[PDB]
């Protein structure tokens with residue numbers, strides 16, 4: 001049972017260049033691939049999909065999301081944003097807050113969008129917290145876990161990275177201790193339901 | 207060096223499978239795994255690698271009784287990483303003297319995991335920082351800093367993690383330290399992984 005999938009969505013630009021197009025074209029084809037992946041995970045009973053946009057441009061990606069929130073909501077998806085948003089324009093932060101509040105009771109897919117996120121950041125913000133307080137000796141795995149992102153959700157079972165690099169690139173680190181790692185050369189805009197099922201297979205086989 | 211790789215970490219898996227394949231008990235897998243350790247350490251010493259970090263896993267320090275003399279003679283700085291405050295005092299003392307012995311060595315740092323976990327690793331660095339806060343700032347805690355307190359903070363960053371044995375995961379080996387590392391998975395079982403395979407891996411970090 002694959003319950004929580006995380007995807008490093010790499011290769012929009014390599015895709016654009018390969019097609020003879022401007023970067024913005026690859027970004028738009030990548031956004032179609034995000035809708036396909038969301039729909040596919042939600043229809044296949046996955047509980048959580050966590051998406052990391054890799055290849056500033058970070059606020060622009062979350063803006064594009066803003067205008068799909070109604071559809072996520074109608075589709076019973078709970079939306080969470082993970083990452084450092086505290087230096088984001090404040091109108092965007094309030095939009096994040098509204099969109100998360102709007103879908104927070106939704107019972108389908110949990111979609112976490114990693115925006116200005118780093119695995120090291122994530123842990124170092126949990127380490128900020130505990131230290132702002134109890135005794136050194138009492139801090140342990142179960143407790144550090146309590147602070148890092150997504151601790152309330154099913155453990156990450158599978159990490160897919162498209163685009164052909166073999167690295168985490170500072171995406172989830174704490175959370176991936178035990179996850180299947182699946183690397184495909186397929187570039188993000190080409191990654192489709194059949195490639196996604198390919199990765200669920202590799203996990204089912206384990 | 208052409209490969210351009212400074213620090214390699216290996217999840218040494220598949221000793222058990224290798225044994226079953228030949229109709230032998232797990233013990234023969236470990237023996238052949240031990241030979242393959244020796245072969246790896248050597249390869250790394252003679253190719254300009256500066257740190258080599260080995261994680262024993264199947265999907266033991268005591269005969270450091272007997273290999274540590276050689277490590278020292280090749281100028282290898284031997285370091286044991288993981289939670290050994292758990293181990294009997296004779297053992298801890300053997301580790302202590304093997305580390306004290308080679309600590310001013312200047313060639314390969316060879317780091318051998320022993321009761322090591324990547325989350326544990328992070329958990330302890332945290333505690334060095336919490337102690338430090340209690341003796342008098344949180345706001346100051348940055349990635350550079352926690353990063354100063356996780357194991358191996360003083361070696362070159364991990365460039366390349368090799369996992370032999372066919373599984374695709376980290377299995378709670380290095381987690382902070384592999385944020386940027388190249389990840390190389392091979393179906394070759396640990397006891398068969400040889401100099402060419404290790405060449406294959408390095409030529410993959412370089413060609414990539």
Ligand SMILES: CCCCCCCCCCOc1cccc(C(=O)Nc2ccc([N+](=O)[O-])cc2C(=O)O)c1
Pocket residue numbers: 030031032034035038039040042043061064065068071072075077
């Ligand atoms: C910068 C990237 C832009 C972000 C776009 C991402 C927004 C996600 C679009 C939401 O569309 C959703 C969302 C959640 C679920 C679904 C969804 O399940 N849709 C479907 C469900 C079933 C089926 N089906 O084959 O029967 C199809 C879909 C579907 O929408 O295609 C669609």
Ligand SMILES: CCCCCCCCCCOc1cccc(C(=O)Nc2ccc([N+](=O)[O-])cc2C(=O)O)c1
Pocket residue numbers: 240241243244262266267273318319320321322
């Ligand atoms: C030719 C040279 C031969 C090279 C052999 C060197 C490889 C030996 C690696 C030693 O690995 C060890 C040694 C002692 C303990 C462990 C170890 O993992 N012990 C554990 C102890 C307690 C617990 N626990 O939380 O209950 C877990 C472990 C554990 O991680 O499995 C690993």
Ligand SMILES: CCCCCCCCCCOc1cccc(C(=O)Nc2ccc([N+](=O)[O-])cc2C(=O)O)c1
Pocket residue numbers: 243244247248251267269270273274276277280282318
């Ligand atoms: C906690 C205990 C630590 C686990 C011990 C790990 C075993 C390490 C084995 C040491 O063997 C080494 C170490 C470093 C270098 C070499 C090495 O250079 N080996 C050789 C290279 C060439 C040649 N040669 O035919 O000329 C021979 C050797 C050789 O050492 O046998 C061997």
